Amino acid sequence: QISVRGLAGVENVTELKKNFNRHLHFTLVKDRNVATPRDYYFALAHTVRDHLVGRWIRTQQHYYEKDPKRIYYLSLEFYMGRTLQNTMVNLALENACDEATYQLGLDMEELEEIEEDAGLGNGGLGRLAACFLDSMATLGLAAYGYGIRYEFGIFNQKICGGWQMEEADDWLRYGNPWEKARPEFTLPVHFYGRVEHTSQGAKWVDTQVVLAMPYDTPVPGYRNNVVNTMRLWSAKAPNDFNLGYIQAVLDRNLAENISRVLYPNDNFFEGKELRLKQEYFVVAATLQDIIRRFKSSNFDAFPDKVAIQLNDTHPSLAIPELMRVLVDLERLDWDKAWEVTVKTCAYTNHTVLPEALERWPVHLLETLLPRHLQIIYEINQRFLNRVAAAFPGDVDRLRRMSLVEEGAVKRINMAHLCIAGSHAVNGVARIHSEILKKTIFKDFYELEPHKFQNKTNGITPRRWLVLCNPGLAEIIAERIGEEYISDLDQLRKLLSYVDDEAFIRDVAKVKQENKLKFAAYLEREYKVHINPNSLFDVQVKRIHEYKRQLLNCLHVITLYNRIKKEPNKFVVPRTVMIGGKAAPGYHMAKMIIKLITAIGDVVNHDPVVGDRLRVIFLENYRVSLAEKVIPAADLSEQISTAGTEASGTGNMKFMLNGALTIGTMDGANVEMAEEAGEENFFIFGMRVEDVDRLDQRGYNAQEYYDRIPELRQIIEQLSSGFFSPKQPDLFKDIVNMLMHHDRFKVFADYEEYVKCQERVSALYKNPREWTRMVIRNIATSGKFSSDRTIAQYAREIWGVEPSRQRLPA
Amino acid sequence: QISVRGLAGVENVTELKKNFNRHLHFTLVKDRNVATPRDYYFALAHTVRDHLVGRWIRTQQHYYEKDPKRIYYLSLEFYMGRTLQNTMVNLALENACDEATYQLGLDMEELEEIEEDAGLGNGGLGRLAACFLDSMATLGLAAYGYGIRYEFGIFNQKICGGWQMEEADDWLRYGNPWEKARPEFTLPVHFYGRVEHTSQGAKWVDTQVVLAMPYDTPVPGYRNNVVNTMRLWSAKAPNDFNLGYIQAVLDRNLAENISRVLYPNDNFFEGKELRLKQEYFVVAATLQDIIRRFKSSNFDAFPDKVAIQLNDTHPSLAIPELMRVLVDLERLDWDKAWEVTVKTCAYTNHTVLPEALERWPVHLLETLLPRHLQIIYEINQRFLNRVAAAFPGDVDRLRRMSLVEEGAVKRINMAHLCIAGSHAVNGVARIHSEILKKTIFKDFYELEPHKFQNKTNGITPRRWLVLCNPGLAEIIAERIGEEYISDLDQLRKLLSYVDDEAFIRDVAKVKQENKLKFAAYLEREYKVHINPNSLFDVQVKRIHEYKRQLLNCLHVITLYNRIKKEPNKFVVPRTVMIGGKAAPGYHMAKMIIKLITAIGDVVNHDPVVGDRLRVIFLENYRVSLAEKVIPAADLSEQISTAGTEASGTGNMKFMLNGALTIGTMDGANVEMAEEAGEENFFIFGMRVEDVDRLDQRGYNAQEYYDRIPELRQIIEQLSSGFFSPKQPDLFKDIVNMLMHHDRFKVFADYEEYVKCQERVSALYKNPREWTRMVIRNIATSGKFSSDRTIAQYAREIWGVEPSRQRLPA
Numbered sequence A, B: 001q002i003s004v005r006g007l008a009g010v011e012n013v014t015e016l017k018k019n020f021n022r023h024l025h026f027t028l029v030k031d032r033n034v035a036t037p038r039d040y041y042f043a044l045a046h047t048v049r050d051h052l053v054g055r056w057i058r059t060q061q062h063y064y065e066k067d068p069k070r071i072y073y074l075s076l077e078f079y080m081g082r083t084l085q086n087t088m089v090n091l092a093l094e095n096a097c098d099e100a101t102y103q104l105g106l107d108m109e110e111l112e113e114i115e116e117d118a119g120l121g122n123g124g125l126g127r128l129a130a131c132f133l134d135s136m137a138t139l140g141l142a143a144y145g146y147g148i149r150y151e152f153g154i155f156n157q158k159i160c161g162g163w164q165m166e167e168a169d170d171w172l173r174y175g176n177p178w179e180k181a182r183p184e185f186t187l188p189v190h191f192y193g194r195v196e197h198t199s200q201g202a203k204w205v206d207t208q209v210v211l212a213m214p215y216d217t218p219v220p221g222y223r224n225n226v227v228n229t230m231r232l233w234s235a236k237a238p239n240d241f242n243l244g245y246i247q248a249v250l251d252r253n254l255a256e257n258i259s260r261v262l263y264p265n266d267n268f269f270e271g272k273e274l275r276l277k278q279e280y281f282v283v284a285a286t287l288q289d290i291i292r293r294f295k296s297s298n299f300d301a302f303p304d305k306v307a308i309q310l311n312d313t314h315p316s317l318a319i320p321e322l323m324r325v326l327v328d329l330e331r332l333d334w335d336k337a338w339e340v341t342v343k344t345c346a347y348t349n350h351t352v353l354p355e356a357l358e359r360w361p362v363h364l365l366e367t368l369l370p371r372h373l374q375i376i377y378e379i380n381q382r383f384l385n386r387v388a389a390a391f392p393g394d395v396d397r398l399r400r401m402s403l404v405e406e407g408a409v410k411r412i413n414m415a416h417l418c419i420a421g422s423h424a425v426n427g428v429a430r431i432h433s434e435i436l437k438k439t440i441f442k443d444f445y446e447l448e449p450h451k452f453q454n455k456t457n458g459i460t461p462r463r464w465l466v467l468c469n470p471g472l473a474e475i476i477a478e479r480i481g482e483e484y485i486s487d488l489d490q491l492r493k494l495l496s497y498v499d500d501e502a503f504i505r506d507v508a509k510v511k512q513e514n515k516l517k518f519a520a521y522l523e524r525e526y527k528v529h530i531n532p533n534s535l536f537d538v539q540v541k542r543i544h545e546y547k548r549q550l551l552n553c554l555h556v557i558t559l560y561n562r563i564k565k566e567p568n569k570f571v572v573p574r575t576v577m578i579g580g581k582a583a584p585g586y587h588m589a590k591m592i593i594k595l596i597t598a599i600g601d602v603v604n605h606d607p608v609v610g611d612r613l614r615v616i617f618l619e620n621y622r623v624s625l626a627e628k629v630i631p632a633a634d635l636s637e638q639i640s641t642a643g644t645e646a647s648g649t650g651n652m653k654f655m656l657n658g659a660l661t662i663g664t665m666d667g668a669n670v671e672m673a674e675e676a677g678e679e680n681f682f683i684f685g686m687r688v689e690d691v692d693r694l695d696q697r698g699y700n701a702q703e704y705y706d707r708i709p710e711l712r713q714i715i716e717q718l719s720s721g722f723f724s725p726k727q728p729d730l731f732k733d734i735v736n737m738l739m740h741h742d743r744f745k746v747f748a749d750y751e752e753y754v755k756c757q758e759r760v761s762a763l764y765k766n767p768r769e770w771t772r773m774v775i776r777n778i779a780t781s782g783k784f785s786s787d788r789t790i791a792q793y794a795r796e797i798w799g800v801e802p803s804r805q806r807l808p809a
């Protein structure tokens, strides 16, 4: 029906229909009389997977013949979401499958809704891994995603009495048609044991064996016929394991627990052994595979044939593990193995928040990975020997830069290990990379300035434009053609349509259609009634103090209080939608969700308010909900305290999808404002420099409470039980934190935020000038393509050249 | 190549080849350059499964339309073995697949060896379930096998220093292409909780929920185009289960443990809660499914539409469960629900051994199934009220017949529950059924003589002749045609070829070919060197005292001692092969394996013996090893103490496959000897009556030790460490048991056994008269077809008529 979804040829459609009926019969063992929508989804999935197989085999073949340099993206998290629509988009089958399914009397969109999200990630970091895989396939890189096949991904969020409840995300229950088990590439991973020192070097003995069984998922490039591989490891007991008899068999579960469940902390370190086991497991199995592939072509050439990218410190053990294999198994000398390791490894840092930094107790590494701790100590000694020689007498530098932290419990600083063991260290936005060089890695920067790079984050315009917003894709494609989907900088051509009446009307119609569609999705799936003519004010992201959902809450209560004070005055109507999961043990995050829903319970049932103000908590925010709500959004809330959001990627998704941003000069907000122009961005609040000035002299929240009557009222309402009549003190922890222990200076930005939110409402009253500013945003969003990001990784870190040339079909 | 394996048409072969290449590509995602033999096996499996699908769908369809009476075979055990060859045989694809694979340059026999046994059973009982499914499909009955999909079947047996080691049978590791998950027919099973009594009857509340997820495996009939279903339940945690967060997700394993592992006890009861959970799990899920199917047609008609066969007491809870559903959920009155239950249920008893009888402690049923215990108590009261009225004043009868056993711990006699709650109770051989009426169920017989039946056991001549012994099948098919494969009584026509020289030469050539093939299989897979011209003396069955492997050991040592006494005298050379698994906690069974291997270590390395006597322990005896060794056997050892082997089925397999039987008048040995004639059977030892006479006056083993010099020598050799030089006392438990606590009277049968074994050697010296006696055995083996058994169940218990008429292809 729309051109960017591809051709529906007569043969193609006929062929899809007969393969759909073949799979319903032979694969699902159903006839049409007893098939459920879920059978129909599976038949279609199997039918689309069949178009991947030829390209997958030819691509892996082609990498064997050409033997290019291979990129290994190691991440504990791949936030993939659904695969079916994405596969159709990249193979150009979407219209043909729409037509084929329509003729069989099925609605393809209904079948798409039956696919489980692959929720093998928490948020920003995990989703960056997924966008990267898409861009590496699209840029024809010989790239492999390596991670863990968690049986349970990020938990399903139910709201119960306005409180978050967690349910196990049992995403594999009905089968995963996208994965292919490769039991024959099963590899042993070792744990515990002890080190014997012999004549012929150190030997790791009396270990417990867990098997790593790989599952391959295809990653299709955008219409280039390239299909790369995501390999995820599953933990499996060896068959001699524990082997009274019955318990031995049941205790196999202990070993398999390693790949059972994703840790649901976003920017929070928990030093749990099971987490360290997951980290070693993925590293040990992946490095054996990388080396096996390398030997099927002397380790001087290893870094010419292998790049390993570490997605944060989560796979930092890749550095000692590569040393251990090269020194203990391959018998290279220390210095040669170390050169190979540094030239192979590169480290992406994702946060500056201290509580997020991985600092593993030594006693844990001692018991679990005895040999790795020895190699870490040896790395530390040689590293501090170079610091001492470059900065003689600077003993405090030696303490600050040590991989080993002294204290009550000794800890390994995994970030320090990553910098020492990597030829390149990057942040994920220019301001973040600058903060790394000025503050937390200042000392490492001064020693090896050449290692520190910026690679500003990006999003795949395939999932985040073509797939979630076909109507916007199309009206863009009507004026400038299709080429921008793999070259997003071409969106700049839209600046010459900023005064075109037809284009202004088309941009605004698509937004209205997305809002109508989302408003309807709310009424069906969650019996809630929103005015589609309201401004859609949305904050969707994990629930964290630093992301200041609470600042948003303060604005919402301010709007409420202003309506009640002057009931009969015009206010631009808004639907305020906030959504995110809280980490299950993050008390404050769980209280913020409860406050959000408690504001809703007051605001949405006030007769005086009407449909002028609605507050909706969006339940179970995940990738597939982001594909629906982001295209429906008018205002993107990016309101982190300056210096806390390393980058953000939500900000980019919304910029691409025709929403204006209200945000701080934080993360990639800075580069977004610079691309669009500051006049096309609702910037407010402290800069990094202002927060620093507040810290030097001390943050007194009382000062703001005492000077801002509007803010005092909100705090009194919270305290006195205006929003919690049956439990008047329900929110004392929130009030108490905002008044005495606010690390994120919520009150400091309150006034500038509310004023800036008035400027938003004013622009929204003028639809034409709102839409023109939206066009200026979409048109300058090109930089924020993960294609640009990956091309920069490739040229400046991996040493490989991207390509948009097609493989043969 | 051979006619009973079907036609290899040009189109059929072309079509199989192109579907094999389609599956290698689309299903396995391999090209021919990287495929392993295991990929080739999977492609073939998928290719053969594709021929099942049409017939499976049409058959289940046809049962919906015709709505026949449905048979539900409830068993905790289905000993299926491999599915690939069996599927080819019953679909007539074997020659076509041989030809199709040959042209692709593969050997189908090599690919068959890659299939894992489905070892979801211990031995006789489990394998009877598998033969029954084959016969019910072949006789066109609307029959369903219902059991548990164990993640781990019967353990893999390694021999280490002559000792049994158990390894987990991880049979699902590479996938099972034969099963189809039906997640959409998932059902809740309840545990624990408590009973509330209301106005509207009793209510089972505050239960823990385990989900039962069914997997369907096709069961093809023999060339009738019928495909029945084996439905196996897998335990699955509900997604709210336990729902700090991480442990909650890991604790899901507790619920899923229910379907994790098969209990490896053959004829031994262990009162473990996990075993009771498995028993309720399969019963609760199966009865919900049976009732759902029944309501898709008032419970008066239930027994006209439903037969439930209980394979021993393992699913006895089906009786209280059916009462609980009918009374508590469907609101029938007690008496009407009870009539329905008795008319629906039938109980097959498999053993008289007291230690095998399921006697569940009340405290276990109290905690786990509170409501079932109440219904059991109510059944007991009404049952004993009928005993009291029929036998007034006989208070001892009341104690003996009670479902509730009094004592230290109160127990439920599950066998008593089965007799009370069933319209029919059968044994599994005529002598066994007679012993049930004279001894252990005498009282139940006197009350309800009409319930007690015999159904002599049988074996499927598809797996146990056509599949394992194609060369014997063929030479039979050359003279009398193919019709006998589904009508085994036609083998009687072979009695008119008992004096045909060509047929005598053909029977003997096939035996020699089977022996050459098996001798070679030993040399390859287990580096052992047997003379193929020796008599193949084989005892294969679970290791149990009652089966008297030890009697066999005594004969073997007797032959050894006789050779050493007269080195230079001729003895018929023998290969003595003994094989079986011991239950992991069965000390004595584990000692017997060690003795067997310890005799081997002495006998096989004695230069004076030569290749005149070899002793081989056959490692990992399972269905697929039975298919190899049984066709190679000359002498079948069936030497249980009279009254202990309820039936046996091995005995039948060997009779069918051209081996002569040395055995006691025990189990179906009696009916085999009566069919063939006693002169065509090596019968020895005590009858049932003689054992009874020995018991009355007392079994003194010393008496035999004192009168049989040959036996004294063996006992002295065992005691003094002749067979265990480094541990002289290794076998003191064996000697001590044979001398003071032999329940099975091994010495009582020793003399008559050795004499009878001399008669065997004498006949073997005359090949022509040996082969003529073999023909008399094969020719009278027809009764021992599971087709006869199932036709008798159908007409005399289930009330349905078998059919050999084809469904349309």
Ligand SMILES: OC[C@H]1O[C@@H](c2nc(-c3ccc4ccccc4c3)cs2)[C@H](O)[C@@H](O)[C@@H]1O
Pocket (backbone or CB within 6 Å): A122, A124, A125, A128, A263, A265, A266, A267, A268, A269, A270, A312, A350, A351, A356, A428, A457, A644, A645, A646, A647, A648, A649, A667
């Ligand atoms: O670069 C991609 C995005 O990364 C986000 C980030 N995620 C994380 C993150 C996630 C999961 C973890 C699990 C265990 C221990 C630490 C963890 C840290 C850190 S920083 C950052 O918070 C975002 O600013 C940024 O856009």
Ligand SMILES: OC[C@H]1O[C@@H](c2nc(-c3ccc4ccccc4c3)cs2)[C@H](O)[C@@H](O)[C@@H]1O
Pocket (backbone or CB within 6 Å): B122, B124, B125, B128, B263, B265, B266, B267, B268, B269, B270, B312, B350, B351, B356, B428, B457, B644, B645, B646, B647, B648, B649, B667
């Ligand atoms: O009828 C089929 C065969 O059944 C054999 C039998 N198996 C069993 C058997 C198996 C597994 C068990 C697991 C747990 C508790 C009790 C169990 C009993 C009993 S009797 C009998 O021992 C054989 O004689 C007979 O041929």
Ligand SMILES: *Cc1c(COP(=O)(O)O)cnc(C)c1O
Pocket (backbone or CB within 6 Å): A122, A123, A124, A127, A540, A541, A542, A621, A622, A623, A624, A626, A647, A648, A649, A650, A651, A653
């Ligand atoms: C993009 C995305 C994120 C990251 O959003 P931020 O606003 O950068 O925190 C988190 N969750 C999901 C589901 C996403 O798609």
Ligand SMILES: *Cc1c(COP(=O)(O)O)cnc(C)c1O
Pocket (backbone or CB within 6 Å): B122, B123, B124, B127, B540, B541, B542, B621, B622, B623, B624, B626, B647, B648, B649, B650, B651, B653
């Ligand atoms: C048939 C069979 C049995 C039963 O044999 P018996 O001699 O009756 O005990 C046990 N195990 C396997 C593998 C079988 O095929």
